[PDB]
Design a protein around this ligand. Structure first.
Ligand SMILES: COC1=C(OC)C(=O)C(C/C=C(\C)CC/C=C(\C)CC/C=C(\C)CC/C=C(\C)CC/C=C(\C)CC/C=C(/C)CC/C=C(\C)CC/C=C(\C)CCC=C(C)C)=C(C)C1=O
Ligand SMILES: CCCCCCCCCCCCCCCCCC(=O)OC[C@H](COP(=O)([O-])OCC[N+](C)(C)C)OC(=O)CCCCCCCCCCCCCCCCC
Ligand SMILES: CCCCCCCCCCCCCCCCCC(=O)OC[C@H](COP(=O)(O)OCCN)OC(=O)CCCCCCCCCCCCCCCCC
Ligand SMILES: CCCCCCCCCCCCCCCCCC(=O)OC[C@H](COP(=O)(O)OCCN)OC(=O)CCCCCCCCCCCCCCCCC
Ligand SMILES: CCCCCCCCCCCCCCCCCC(=O)OC[C@H](COP(=O)(O)OCCN)OC(=O)CCCCCCCCCCCCCCCCC
Ligand SMILES: CCCCCCCCCCCCCCCCCC(=O)OC[C@H](COP(=O)(O)OCCN)OC(=O)CCCCCCCCCCCCCCCCC
Ligand code: SF4
Ligand code: SF4
Lengths: 66, 117, 73, 315, 97, 173, 67, 161, 186
């Protein structure tokens, strides 16, 4: 077969690609999870950010605990 | 920088002094026509070292120039992960490493990575 | 008889540890502070200018005693 | 104040320079004792007391011995190449992380990459300058080494860099506070040592010297003064690259004492390997770097790009 | 990774309490300097043919801008009347000389 | 200050570079200059990130051309030019003299170093190279990087086809 | 684990650290053995089966030689 | 060159690193052995064969000893055969250690050279204990070996094996 | 175990005959070692193990040997317990010396005894074969135990009779002990 030949000839590219394939998978989980949390709106902001109470962004302040 | 340059010079001076001591501390004897002859296992040499030395990894030699210039484009990744759009950063990065692998495996399968034979 | 190696390893271990343990000593003796300020970020550098200006020595601290204690109002 | 600050930076470099220069002398003794014990030999034991002053007892000879002026060599190049070989070996130490600041070095990881690459020219120029057949083969055997390890070296560094978030070496300390990256990066640690050997041109990757294939490689036409500096510059590379393994995979507690117990141990490993493996074949290395290591390293960038992305979502 | 982030945010949060303080200080000294430069320019070039302070011989360096629109000059122009020592003391703090 | 002395050296090394004939003499001249230009560029920038990259990139090209120089132009000659050594040394000291008696607030380049920036510039307090390299990997400029990728990979197909590995090694027959 | 007890003993017949050091500096080794005999010229011959065959019998040269 | 064993002179024709032609120039160790033998009695010529194939010492003697015996048309006693055969094998074990030991150094590995030359040192005590020389025993002779084995040797031969 | 590619007859051993299995149980086993440096791992265990052995070195010159009574070394002309030299200038040693390293000139002594007026050995020509001591009918010439006689001049390596006789007196005690413990074999 094919699987056997490579697994016998170049086992590293099989094992390496096995973890490479792991990267794409759990990259697809994390990326989807990121927009499942609205992670664009981050509770901690670089710089000194101040909004006016009437600004549209002032509604979207992520309200967290710590 | 300007600190590093100064110490770079200071070290170079120090290492330079080392042989300048060696050149004087070295025992001195009259140089012979044979003492300064090249070493080639005790038999006079047929061929100057400045003849054209054939090359067999020339193809890899060129590929080395390329692959480095993509190292210039992966290195910035980390620095801009906190600051970039995750889809654009994620997508582009992957299709950067897949492109590299595909290129490598393509040539590997074509046998270009093997030396001239 | 594996002891005879250790004299080689003790010397290298000590010699390589002299620098970091020396500057930690020299800085205290010569700055008054064990560690030197880290110019890794703009904010660190900016404040370092500020200290160097006020006290005329970035490693000499200006506690509350620099504050004018009282205002006549 | 500020005027005083840079004075201390000079002292540190000089202190680090003399300490490294001294250690490479004692490393060479350690190499002979350990390599003399892996082999059932005793090793240097007579000179002075129990052999400890042996390396100094050799530094005398290599300097009271005459310079060699090769007849067919471009003398100025032949004469200068030792200097830059030693200079580049010492200079790369200024980026070694200290919590007691020595040099800031944001982008310190890159500074490693630049300096290590330079070490090839000194071998390269020395071999070509000597103008001997073996010396030239040694030089071109060294250059082909760079073509192999150079690209894979950067990628493997990038994987470690993704874990810490920046090119500043100091951050390795904070992330290795609970555990050691050796656990997470076991195959890379094993691969990284392999590339580290190529950097310093050691068995099983000893091609620049090429002992028993070339008579002495690119050193074949050097003598008392030049050859000594070439030698010291060689073992300074081992010492640093051993340290760079300790800051990446073994805690990076530079101010703790154990870090230096670790540092010597990795130095022992480099000698340990020299007494175990036969030398690779000149082509098998270049195939190894491109056929296996390069493909291997790229595979984990995906693994760590995904892992960092996944971890970013949670945090 | 949590603990590193924990520590980083704490360090950054300390900036946001100090950063407003410095900006208050800088402005009250940035302005004071501008008066001195506008006065040094007057004295330096009393006898120049057509020199007007703040313009190139009467040509305003910004035509579209509204009235009394303050513009932060160039670093060099800010130090136009200063020794090299003071200039280098700020521009080369990164490199350390 | 060293910026002017860097100006002198880059000029000096360029004068001699016009007069090199031996390929390795050219290479040594070029290698020295690649150091200075790399050093000089980082003076007028918020970081030395690009000097590191440029230095690393060119060193790759430095090795490769030695490999071909040592195979094609191996047997060539040097000639010390007393006219050249005096001329460069003559101007070099002459230029170095000016840099000591120069109004070197005027000679400094107006490009804003990181410290040259104001204290209020909130965007200057982030990582050393965060923003600058940012939009290399964000919409829409990211596609340019992608375009390079094919361009680089398509290049990788060009060399093997131009090269025709199978028809032998390279020798200076 | 318990070689120190041997090590202290070697000192005692040596004559304290001062004479132990000179012994180590001269013979390059410290060994326990029984004096088999003394030749006409002062050399003292030792033996200890504890060590392996080659190092089983050793000689101390006369003090006046000294190197 | 270290790998050449101080005798060989390969005039290689190198197309890079690959060899296109190899010319093994030989004769750097020609000592006209076969012309000296024509001037020496048969016994005086026995040491010459210790020198030929100098790592197989007692194996060369056996070849010479057998040759002279066929011309002399004599037979060796039963005991001498076993002593000969025993020492032919000990020589064989010595020689292969040199081949393996030397071959490893050429490749680059070091430890097998020392781990085996420690045993090689023990083996050449048996040469030294029967013949009186650690090498070039000159022990095998046309009539059989020249002396009986020392009392108690065979116990130490067993101990090594 | 895998099979053998070539069937083996009697009285013969093959070194590379077994083929490679293709079962996943084995391929993975080969793959794991090829992939985690498994083969080299045990190689590193072995070498490290040798650190924990007594090294076999001898502290020469304080400790040295071992040798055997048959050892062939420097030469020496013995003499009878009366003191008279054993050698009678029979010249068997000269005739058998493969290297022709011996030169002897003999003359009727004053008291009328056959004796040598000359006996020279060219130690840079001798091969220490030991045929001289086997041929001597009166054990006059022997290869003494000494093997430490390197000189700093070529001329000092040419022994004449007085030098040889001196050795036969310096080394007399040990030679007489070796001959006694070894003559029966010879
Ligand atoms: C027979 O089979 C075999 C082979 O086949 C041929 C082999 O090849 C081999 C090959 C073996 C190897 C490759 C082993 C590795 C060894 C080598 C590659 C080279 C051999 C040399 C060594 C081991 C010595 C190491 C050290 C050096 C070469 C010199 C390095 C420079 C040094 C130490 C100087 C350091 C600088 C300092 C400032 C230190 C402190 C001060 C000093 C030195 C100053 C000294 C004195 C003074 C200044 C005088 C002052 C006096 C007054 C003021 C009165 C073996 C083992 C073998 O068995
Ligand atoms: C193409 C890629 C080339 C990449 C390699 C660049 C460096 C190779 C330089 C080789 C020597 C050139 C030369 O012969 O000039 C002789 C020159 C003199 O030129 P010359 O013309 O007087 O030499 C001929 C002399 N006569 C006339 C008598 C025959 O001498 C030097 O000063 C050269 C110093 C070289 C120092 C060693 C360089 C090592 C650099 C390491 C990396 C950087 C750190
Ligand atoms: C105690 C201290 C001990 C210190 C030891 C230090 C050793 C340092 C010296 C190491 C160098 C040894 C020689 C060498 O370089 O070997 C490299 C290795 C050899 O293998 P190779 O030559 O390629 O095989 C034959 C190819 N024709 O080349 C390789 O092939 C190695 C490739 C490594 C690939 C690793 C892949 C790991 C994949 C991990 C996941 C696997 C699990 C299954 C998949 C999971 C998917 C979710
Ligand atoms: C699961 C992936 C299956 C891939 C199947 C590859 C099986 C055999 C690989 C191999 O190496 O066999 C030899 C083949 C011949 O290619 P050649 O031109 O001789 O170049 C040198 C190759 N070592 O080598 C090759 O042609 C290709 C070698 C690289 C293939 C990597 C593919 C990885 C895909 C993921
Ligand atoms: C500084 C001077 C340090 C040396 C003082 C020596 C005083 C002891 C008496 C004289 C003496 O013994 O000197 C030689 C000494 C030991 O004798 P040694 O030649 O090594 O013989 C083997 C001993 N087991 O061997 C030595 O230790 C001499 C070492 C001196 C040179 C060391 C190299 C660095 C330069 C120092 C100056
Ligand atoms: C005569 C001419 C005298 C002028 C000096 C020429 C020798 C140059 C030696 C200095 C090279 C090192 C250097 O200058 O690096 C500068 C820069 C540092 O930037 P940074 O990351 O901020 O770290 C600062 C830490 N204090 O990092 C860089 O720009 C990259 C530097 C790469 C250095 C390669 C090593 C060159 C060694 C000298 C070869 C000659
Ligand atoms: S040992 Fe042999 S070669 Fe030497 S002198 Fe005696 S017979 Fe001649
Ligand atoms: S064989 Fe003996 S007795 Fe005859 S000459 Fe030689 S040493 Fe003298």
């Amino acid at each position: 077969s094919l699987l056997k030949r490579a697994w016998n000839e170049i086992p590293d590219i099989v094992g390496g690609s096995a973890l490479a394939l792991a990267g794409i998978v759990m990259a697809t989980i994390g990326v989807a999870n990121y927009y499942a949390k609205d992670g664009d709106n981050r509770r901690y902001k670089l710089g000194y950010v101040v909004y006016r109470h009437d600004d549209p962004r002032a509604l979207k302040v992520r309200n967290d605990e710590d | 920088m300007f600190s590093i340059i100064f110490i770079a010079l200071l070290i170079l001076l120090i290492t330079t002094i080392v042989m300048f001591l060696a050149s004087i501390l070295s025992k001195k004897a009259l140089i012979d026509r044979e003492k300064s002859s090249p070493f080639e296992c005790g038999f006079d040499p047929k061929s100057s070292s400045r003849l054209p030395f054939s090359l067999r990894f020339f193809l890899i030699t060129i590929i080395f120039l390329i692959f480095d210039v993509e190292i210039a484009l992966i290195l910035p990744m980390i620095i801009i992960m906190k600051y970039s759009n995750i889809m654009i950063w994620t997508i582009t990065s992957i299709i950067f490493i897949l492109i590299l692998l595909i290129g490598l495996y393509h040539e590997w399968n074509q046998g270009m990575l093997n030396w001239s034979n | 008889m594996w002891f005879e190696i250790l004299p080689g390893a003790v010397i290298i271990t000590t010699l390589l540890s002299v620098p970091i343990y020396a500057m930690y000593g020299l800085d205290k003796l010569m700055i008054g502070n064990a560690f030197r300020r880290n110019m890794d970020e703009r904010f660190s550098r900016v404040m370092y200018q500020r200290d160097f200006r006020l006290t005329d020595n970035p490693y000499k601290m200006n506690g509350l005693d620099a504050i004018p204690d009282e205002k006549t109002n | 104040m500020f005027y005083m600050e840079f004075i201390l930076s000079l002292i540190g470099s000089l202190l680090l320079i003399i300490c490294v220069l001294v250690s490479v002398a004692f490393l060479t003794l350690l190499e002979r004792k350990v390599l003399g014990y892996i082999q059932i030999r005793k090793g240097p034991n007579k000179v002075g007391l129990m052999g400890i002053p042996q390396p100094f007892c050799d530094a005398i000879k290599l300097f009271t011995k005459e310079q060699t002026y090769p007849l067919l060599s471009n003398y100025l190049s032949y004469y200068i190449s030792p200097i830059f070989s030693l200079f580049l070996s010492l200079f790369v130490w200024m980026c070694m992380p200290f919590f007691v600041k020595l040099y800031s070095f944001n982008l310190g990881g890159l500074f490693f990459l630049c300096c290590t690459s330079l070490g090839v020219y000194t071998v390269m120029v020395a071999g070509w300058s000597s103008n001997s057949n073996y010396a030239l083969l040694g030089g071109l055997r060294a250059v082909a080494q760079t073509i192999s390890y150079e690209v894979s070296l950067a990628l493997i560094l990038l994987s470690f860099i993704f874990l810490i978030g920046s090119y500043n070496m100091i951050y390795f300390f904070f992330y290795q506070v609970y555990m050691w990256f050796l656990i997470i990066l076991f195959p890379m640690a094993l691969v990284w040592v392999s590339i580290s050997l190529a950097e310093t041109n050691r068995t099983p990757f000893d091609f620049a010297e090429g002992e028993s294939e070339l008579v002495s490689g690119f050193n074949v036409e050097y003598s008392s003064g030049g050859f000594a500096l070439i030698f010291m510059a060689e073992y300074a590379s081992i010492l640093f690259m051993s340290m760079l393994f300790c800051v990446i995979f073994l805690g990076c507690d530079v101010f703790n004492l154990l870090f230096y117990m670790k540092l010597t141990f990795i130095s022992f490993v480099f000698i340990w390997v020299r007494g175990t493996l036969p030398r690779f074949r000149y082509d098998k290395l270049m195939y190894l770097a491109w056929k296996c290591f390069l493909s291997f390293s790229l595979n984990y960038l995906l693994f760590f790009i995904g892992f960092k992305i996944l971890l970013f979502s949670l945090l | 990774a949590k603990k590193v982030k924990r520590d980083e945010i704490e360090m950054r949060s300390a900036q946001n309490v100090i950063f407003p303080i410095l900006v208050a200080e800088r402005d009250r000294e940035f302005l004071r300097q501008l008066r001195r430069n506008r006065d040094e320019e007057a004295e330096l070039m009393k006898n120049v043919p057509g020199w007007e302070v703040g313009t190139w011989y009467g040509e305003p360096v910004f035509k579209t801008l509204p009235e009394d629109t303050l513009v932060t000059p160039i670093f060099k122009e800010f130090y136009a009347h200063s020794d090299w020592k003071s200039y280098a003391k700020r521009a080369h703090l990164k490199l350390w000389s | 200050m060293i910026q002017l002395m860097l100006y002198s050296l880059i000029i000096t090394t360029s004068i001699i570079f016009l007069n090199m004939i031996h390929p390795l003499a050219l290479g040594l001249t070029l290698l020295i200059q690649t150091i200075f230009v790399c050093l000089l560029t980082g003076l007028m920038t918020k970081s030395f990130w690009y000097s590191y990259i440029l230095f690393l990139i060119f060193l790759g090209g430095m090795l490769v051309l030695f490999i071909y120089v040592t195979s094609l132009a191996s047997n060539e000659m040097f000639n010390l030019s007393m006219k050249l050594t005096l001329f460069s040394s003559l101007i070099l000291i002459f230029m170095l003299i000016l840099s000591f008696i120069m109004d070197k607030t005027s000679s400094s380049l107006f490009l804003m170093n990181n410290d040259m920036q104001s204290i209020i510039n909130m965007n200057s307090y982030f990582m050393e190279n965060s923003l600058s390299l940012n939009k290399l990997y964000n919409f829409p400029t990211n596609f340019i990087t992608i375009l390079l990728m094919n361009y680089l990979l398509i290049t990788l197909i060009v060399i093997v086809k131009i090269t025709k590995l199978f028809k032998g090694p390279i020798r200076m027959m | 684990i318990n070689r120190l007890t041997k090590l202290f003993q070697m000192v005692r017949e040596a004559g304290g650290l001062k004479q132990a050091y000179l012994k180590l500096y001269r013979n390059d080794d410290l060994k326990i053995g029984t004096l088999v005999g003394i030749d006409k010229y002062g050399n003292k011959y030792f033996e200890n089966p504890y060590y392996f065959y080659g190092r089983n019998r050793w000689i101390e040269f006369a003090p006046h030689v000294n190197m | 060159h270290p790998a050449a064993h101080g005798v060989l002179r390969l005039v290689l024709e190198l197309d890079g690193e690959t060899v296109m032609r190899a010319d093994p120039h030989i004769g750097l160790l020609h000592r006209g052995t076969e012309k000296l033998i024509e001037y020496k009695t048969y016994t005086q010529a026995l040491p010459y064969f210790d020198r030929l194939d100098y790592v197989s010492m007692m194996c060369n003697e056996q070849c010479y000893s057998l040759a002279v015996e066929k011309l002399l048309n004599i037979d060796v006693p039963l005991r001498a055969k076993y002593i000969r055969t025993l020492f032919a094998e000990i020589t064989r074990i010595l020689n292969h250690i040199m081949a393996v030991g030397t071959h490893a150094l050429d490749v680059g590995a070091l430890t097998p050279f020392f781990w085996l030359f420690e045993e090689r040192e023990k083996m050449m005590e048996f040469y030294e204990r029967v013949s009186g020389a650690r090498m070039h025993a000159a022990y095998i002779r046309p009539g059989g070996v020249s002396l009986d084995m020392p009392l108690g040797l065979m116990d130490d031969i067993y101990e090594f094996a | 175990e895998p099979k053998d590619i070539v069937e083996v007859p009697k009285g013969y051993v093959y070194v590379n005959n077994k083929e490679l299995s293709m079962e996943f149980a084995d391929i993975t086993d080969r793959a794991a070692s090829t992939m985690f440096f498994g083969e080299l791992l045990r190689g590193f265990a072995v070498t490290l193990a040798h650190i924990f052995k007594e090294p076999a070195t001898i502290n020469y010159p304080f400790e040295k040997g071992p040798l055997s009574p048959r050892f062939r070394g420097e030469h020496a002309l013995r003499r009878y317990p009366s003191g008279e030299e054993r050698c009678i200038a029979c010249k068997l040693c000269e005739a058998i010396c493969p290297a022709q390293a011996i030169t002897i000139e003999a003359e009727e002594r004053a008291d009328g005894s056959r004796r040598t007026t000359r006996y020279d050995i060219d130690m840079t020509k001798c091969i220490y074969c030991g045929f001289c001591q086997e041929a001597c009918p009166v054990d006059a010439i022997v290869e003494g135990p000494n093997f430490e006689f390197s000189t700093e001049t070529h001329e000092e390596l040419l022994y004449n009779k007085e030098k040889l006789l001196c050795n036969g007196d310096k080394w007399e005690s040990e030679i007489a002990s070796n001959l006694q413990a070894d003559h029966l074999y010879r």
